[PDB]
């Protein structure tokens, strides 16, 4: 990118996404697909798109804050003392640093995700 | 304030005690804002919560910082300094680099959820 145009997230059809799976499954077969729209601050900062199939599996954000937008579908977000977050469509959230609550995919969902590492 | 254990979700309802202020470089219009903070963290990184503008014009310069913009309601165009337009609205997601100094061009009314990391 460049520090003079605009770059805006690409929501349509992903271009060349990137495989991947939960590195900390719970159940289910959950497997990603991510799309990297920006990165900046020499490797520290990350923006894109990443979306999920079913399943449910644990995040570990050490060393990052992450915010995520929810574009498409629905999942829940439960934290370590079981405080369940349901989100869908249009929801905005953080999970701050050091956060290990887990996703709950019934179905399918897509974000938009903003990483930021300390 | 905020726990690491605990998900912060950010309120896009009514603002809550929001702080005004207004445009730094203002070009047209008097805009005029309201931002509500969401979520502090990173010890003065990071920021992120809710910011509004009426109409006019102002420009841009995010030197300093990165910032990640999602319209959640009305819309507005910005103006790269080359002159390429991009109309936004809302569900519309971008960034600012670093160092941005496009403008803004509001025509009525525009809400934002915002996402800043100071570099």
């Known amino acids: 990118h460049d520090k003079s145009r605009l770059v805006r997230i690409d929501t349509g059809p992903m271009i060349n996404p990137v495989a991947g799976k939960p590195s ?3 159940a289910g077969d959950a497997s990603f697909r991510t799309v990297t729209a920006f990165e900046g601050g020499q490797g520290k900062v990350e923006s894109g798109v990443w979306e999920s199939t079913s399943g449910s599996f644990q995040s570990n954000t050490t060393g990052y804050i992450e915010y995520c937008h929810i574009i498409e579908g629905e999942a829940r977000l439960v934290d370590p003392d079981g405080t369940v977050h ?9 999970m701050p640093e050091g956060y290990t609550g887990r996703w709950e ?6 974000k938009i995700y903003f990483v930021t590492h300390l």
């Open 105 to 110: 995919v019934d179905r399918h969902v897509k």
């Open 86 to 94: 349901a989100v869908k469509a249009g929801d905005a959230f953080i």
């Open 24 to 26: 900390r499954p719970i």
